[PDB]
Amino acid sequence: MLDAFAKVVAQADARGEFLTNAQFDALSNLVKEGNKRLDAVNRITSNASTIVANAARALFAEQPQLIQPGGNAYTNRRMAACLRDMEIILRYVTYAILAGDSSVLDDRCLNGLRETYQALGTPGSSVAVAIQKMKDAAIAIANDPNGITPGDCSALMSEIAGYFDRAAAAVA
Amino acid sequence: MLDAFAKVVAQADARGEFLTNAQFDALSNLVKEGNKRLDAVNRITSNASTIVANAARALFAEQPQLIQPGGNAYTNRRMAACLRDMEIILRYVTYAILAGDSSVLDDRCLNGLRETYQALGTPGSSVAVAIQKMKDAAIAIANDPNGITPGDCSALMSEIAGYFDRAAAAVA
Amino acid sequence: MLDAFAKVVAQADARGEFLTNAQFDALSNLVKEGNKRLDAVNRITSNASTIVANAARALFAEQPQLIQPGGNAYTNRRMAACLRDMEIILRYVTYAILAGDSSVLDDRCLNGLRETYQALGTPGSSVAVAIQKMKDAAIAIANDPNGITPGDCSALMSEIAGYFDRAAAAVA
Amino acid sequence: MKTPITEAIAAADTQGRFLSNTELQAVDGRFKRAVASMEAARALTNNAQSLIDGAAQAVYQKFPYTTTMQGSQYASTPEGKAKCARDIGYYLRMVTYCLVAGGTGPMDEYLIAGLSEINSTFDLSPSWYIEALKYIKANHGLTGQAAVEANAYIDYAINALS
Amino acid sequence: MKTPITEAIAAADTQGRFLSNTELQAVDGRFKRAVASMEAARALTNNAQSLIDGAAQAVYQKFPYTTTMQGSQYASTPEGKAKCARDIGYYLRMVTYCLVAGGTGPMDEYLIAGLSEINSTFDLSPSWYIEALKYIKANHGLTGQAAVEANAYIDYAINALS
Amino acid sequence: MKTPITEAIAAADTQGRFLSNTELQAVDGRFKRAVASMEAARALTNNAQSLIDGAAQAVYQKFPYTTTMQGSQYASTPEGKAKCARDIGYYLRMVTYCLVAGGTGPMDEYLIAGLSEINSTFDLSPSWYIEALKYIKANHGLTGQAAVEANAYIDYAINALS
Ligand SMILES: *[C@@H](C)[C@H]1/C(=C/c2[nH]c(/C=C3N=C(/C=C4\NC(=O)C(CC)=C4C)C(C)=C\3CCC(=O)O)c(CCC(=O)O)c2C)NC(=O)[C@@H]1C
Ligand SMILES: *[C@@H](C)[C@H]1/C(=C/c2[nH]c(/C=C3N=C(/C=C4\NC(=O)C(CC)=C4C)C(C)=C\3CCC(=O)O)c(CCC(=O)O)c2C)NC(=O)[C@@H]1C
Ligand SMILES: *[C@@H](C)[C@H]1/C(=C/c2[nH]c(/C=C3N=C(/C=C4\NC(=O)C(CC)=C4C)C(C)=C\3CCC(=O)O)c(CCC(=O)O)c2C)NC(=O)[C@@H]1C
Ligand SMILES: *[C@H](C)[C@H]1/C(=C/c2[nH]c(/C=C3N=C(/C=C4\NC(=O)C(CC)=C4C)C(C)=C\3CCC(=O)O)c(CCC(=O)O)c2C)NC(=O)[C@@H]1C
Ligand SMILES: *[C@H](C)[C@H]1/C(=C/c2[nH]c(/C=C3N=C(/C=C4\NC(=O)C(CC)=C4C)C(C)=C\3CCC(=O)O)c(CCC(=O)O)c2C)NC(=O)[C@@H]1C
Ligand SMILES: *[C@H](C)[C@H]1/C(=C/c2[nH]c(/C=C3N=C(/C=C4\NC(=O)C(CC)=C4C)C(C)=C\3CCC(=O)O)c(CCC(=O)O)c2C)NC(=O)[C@@H]1C
Ligand SMILES: *[C@H](C)[C@H]1/C(=C/c2[nH]c(/C=C3N=C(/C=C4\NC(=O)C(CC)=C4C)C(C)=C\3CCC(=O)O)c(CCC(=O)O)c2C)NC(=O)[C@@H]1C
Ligand SMILES: *[C@H](C)[C@H]1/C(=C/c2[nH]c(/C=C3N=C(/C=C4\NC(=O)C(CC)=C4C)C(C)=C\3CCC(=O)O)c(CCC(=O)O)c2C)NC(=O)[C@@H]1C
Ligand SMILES: *[C@H](C)[C@H]1/C(=C/c2[nH]c(/C=C3N=C(/C=C4\NC(=O)C(CC)=C4C)C(C)=C\3CCC(=O)O)c(CCC(=O)O)c2C)NC(=O)[C@@H]1C
User: Fold this and answer.
1) Of A36, B72, C73, D81, which one's alpha carbon is 20 to 30 angstroms from that of F145?
2) CATH number of domain containing C16
3) Which residues form a coiled coil (chains D, E, F)?
4) Does the beta-carbon distance from C14 to B68 stay under 8 Å?
């Protein structure tokens, strides 16, 4: 597992070099935007149960075949397993937001997941729909302009978007 | 593991249905022939050691190369292993007779066995000869007309035959 | 694991035979040269640390890219792992000298090692260079004419050579 | 799936044994009890629609707030009433399956695993479903050992909701 | 296969070590004892046919019932006599293998694993085979440390049958 | 790699949890301390060449025998002096990496695992490297909390060599 700082260090060691000034300045830039990164993780975390629930209700209304007898989310054991999977993806995405790097997400979550769904009979394209719905909910909560000191968080919302998409691409 | 009843239930749940009258009547039919199913399992079980021994002596007389030095049943460790394999197949077959379904046999015995014999150098066609000999012995013992209340057990002997053949087909 | 005696026994049992006189005489020959086999294992063993060290220093002088940043033996953890690998090969080779058969070496060391180096990114041809250097050092120490009762050990040095080469062929 | 016949095999196989007399006695007990279990499963299946329709109205009369409050968890809209009637039928249908197999296996696998997670996540109260099951028990119209069989499985579900 | 040389390697490898002096002493002991072991293996091999023929007759005189009762387990038929003579030769041949290797390994792998299962399954008595081994011990005609080597392995087999 | 941010994730993930306030406080502490750590890393990087050149001469004055004895482990030849100066630079470079990441991770992975094996195998003395690190500590020219950051990592390396 790396973070954005350790990333830069492991690259410089590969060629046996001290850091350039450009690199110190880019890492100083990271540290200065850190408050906003912290607001985003707290907001998304404090509403975790509602993000998952509403995305689930949405998917089953659009794709009602998933819950008909014979469906991949029919019976309470398969429904519970589906709900669990959503909670987990959302967790490893919040980890990667803190770290500022996708390595915790790729290495401990997405790696091998496509093959798992194909072996179980779970439709991967359906999962990717669920991820995309959690994304749009999360960005709205994090970038809500109320009850916070005003400023610009757009570069951060663009980075966040990236992590959700990456999870989506990996299952489909 | 399923039995003949659980089988019917898991099929009806797949399409979200209550049972039809045809199905209640077929399952009532099962319950009425249950005594004979019980006689057959007791008779075959009470003579297990003799069924295995006589089938072994028969195979080695017909295929004497199996016990020549270099053979797959030469030395007491390989002979013991061969005798063991026969005892096991006979056991999982008696289980499936009780249950009225082949799932315990397929899932916990036959599944992966062909590949095992090919990796060890054991001749699978020879094993299938041994199974067929245990079969003819078992059906004779179960359908012996003496010391029992007379009746017709032919449909049951046909079902029993099926399980032995299935084991045979899987190794060869 | 076999030794040279057990080898002959397992072959004779395969065809169900007592030993011929030719075989008793060849095994009597083995027992008569046993002192020299014992001198060779003690000498090579008593200088194990120097054989490994000097071969390592030699390889890194010839192939200095291995220890440049980014190299397969750069950092103290990878260097330590490299040194360890050499110590191990040298150990299983001394075992096979005692036994007079290569089965302990093939079965517990060389088997699967090529595939391991390919998966890690370790250059196998470089390892084989290191093995060959330990060989030439070991034969010189074992066949040193001083401080020992004179005689001829050439057939034994030829057998020893064989084991080092076999290890070399397997990684490259 | 747990039935009196799969339990018997499981005990022999666990210890490496052939079946013995100890196990055969169990399976005969099952075969003898089946006459009563089938009587009950057929009756419940034939009268299923009026049992479901009466059970839903019993819930609505006991907790009137579920037909008036706003929320997707309630029966205040036509879709919500549709979904409540479907759940009650799921529960009835699992009772008939238990009776046919001679034990709890089907209700264990298809319904009770995951139950408390689903109820918490979608804001559904256990007390609602208990009321419905009590209505079916009181009005299935069965007598004797067939009523005994039906009640043992209905009470099994009530305990899991408590 | 268990020999004095494979045991020595096994102890070094188990603990991750190079061989030491502790282990080299063992292997020299083996090399020194070999002069007596080979003397015995050659003698037993050269006189094998009369030892097998005399051992079978000793069994038939001690348990006369094995040449008269009906059954495929007995020596009451020509095929049964053929099979008994073959087993006795298996036992002799495993003794010579032990002597050549310097330990019990061959008799462990080729004969003693599975022995009590095979005897029970085909209705063969241990006492029959013990009698034959006693005959070979009493008549191999060996003296000194070579007789000592032969007897230690014959007695090993008798104990496994007891 | 061990940093204050990877430790925080590791504790949540180990117990199956989402991040909480307990963990967010840690990462803010890290972000606040970074102003001092960067001041130190830049200063050490800018003056690296005179620090390495002065550190090597301090070693040679304390243990004069390393510039005269024969052996590939010593600095008695031009190649040996070249190699000693390179090792000292490795050590300095790992201190700057620790400061940038906010913890010991880099020095743990790239240098301290394997250290005592390498020193024993090539006949290199710990005391030599400790002397060099003491020279850098005494002459980096830093003051205040930036000198505090630099010294905590230099002392970390000295302890591993003791
Ligand atoms: C973009 C996400 C939205 C936004 C963010 C924003 N926040 C600040 C300032 C602060 N954020 C914090 C938050 C924390 N510090 C912690 O240690 C923790 C966890 C323990 C949290 C959650 C703090 C303390 C500040 C400074 C104090 C304050 O209230 O101002 C800013 C200001 C700029 C900065 O980086 O300091 C901004 C812009 N504001 C928006 O309008 C977006 C919708
Ligand atoms: C076909 C296999 C042979 C045959 C069978 C046969 N059996 C019966 C009747 C009975 N069988 C039993 C046996 C058991 N009940 C148990 O609970 C157990 C284990 C604990 C056993 C072994 C019993 C009790 C009966 C009824 C009493 C009786 O002795 O009659 C029948 C009769 C028809 C029926 O299904 O009841 C038959 C036909 N008979 C043959 O001729 C075949 C060779
Ligand atoms: C070839 C490798 C070199 C060589 C060998 C050589 N050795 C001997 C004789 C002996 N070697 C030993 C050694 C041991 N016996 C043990 O039990 C152990 C370990 C516990 C060891 C190391 C002994 C005892 C002897 C006999 C006594 C003696 O010192 O002579 C010979 C002589 C021939 C023989 O096989 O006996 C030879 C030739 N000699 C060389 O010149 C080669 C360079
Ligand atoms: C819900 C949106 C969809 C759905 C999901 C579904 N998944 C499973 C089973 C599994 N999911 C995983 C995934 C993970 N396990 C991990 O540890 C991690 C990373 C930490 C991940 C990402 C695994 C391993 C399984 C198999 C094991 C298990 O189920 O416990 C199921 C179960 C299917 C079944 O039981 O047969 C389901 C239903 N189903 C849908 O219809 C949605 C599209
Ligand atoms: C006898 C008719 C034939 C014969 C048999 C033979 N089999 C083996 C080895 C194995 N048999 C199995 C099979 C199973 N193990 C299980 O657990 C189950 C289901 C519960 C089955 C069906 C396995 C796994 C093995 C390998 C492991 C073992 O041997 O314990 C051997 C041994 C061969 C050897 O030791 O090299 C033999 C001899 N050989 C014949 O010639 C007959 C045709
Ligand atoms: C040194 C001459 C070369 C070199 C070596 C190198 N090897 C590894 C890693 C491994 N080596 C092994 C080998 C074995 N393990 C065993 O148990 C046995 C038999 C008993 C053998 C033969 C294994 C399994 C590994 C992987 C596990 C481990 O490293 O502990 C490394 C490590 C590489 C890394 O950490 O990424 C290295 C460096 N490298 C060179 O450049 C030389 C050519
Ligand atoms: C009826 C007594 C009360 C009630 C009903 C109600 N239920 C839901 C939603 C769900 N019901 C289930 C139940 C099951 N699914 C299964 O697969 C099984 C086992 C076969 C059972 C028992 C589930 C999983 C859900 C959630 C998913 C889905 O919609 O299918 C709703 C809708 C809630 C929502 O938020 O959409 C309602 C209204 N509510 C009342 O007010 C009645 C008194
Ligand atoms: C002789 C003292 C008495 C006796 C002999 C007898 N033995 C058998 C059958 C078998 N003998 C063995 C023995 C071995 N097989 C091996 O691979 C090894 C190790 C190398 C041994 C020791 C076995 C396995 C059998 C059964 C299989 C086979 O026939 O080969 C028989 C035949 C018994 C039968 O039922 O066919 C007999 C007669 N019986 C006497 O009466 C003698 C006094
Ligand atoms: C300098 C204070 C004294 C000294 C230096 C000296 N060192 C070596 C050889 C080695 N140095 C290392 C160190 C590292 N390699 C790494 O990858 C890392 C982490 C990034 C470190 C710290 C190693 C592994 C070696 C051995 C392999 C190599 O040559 O690279 C030498 C050469 C010793 C030899 O026998 O070749 C010397 C001379 N010696 C002194 O006298 C100085 C006072």
Assistant:
1) A36
2) 1.10.490.20
3) none
4) no
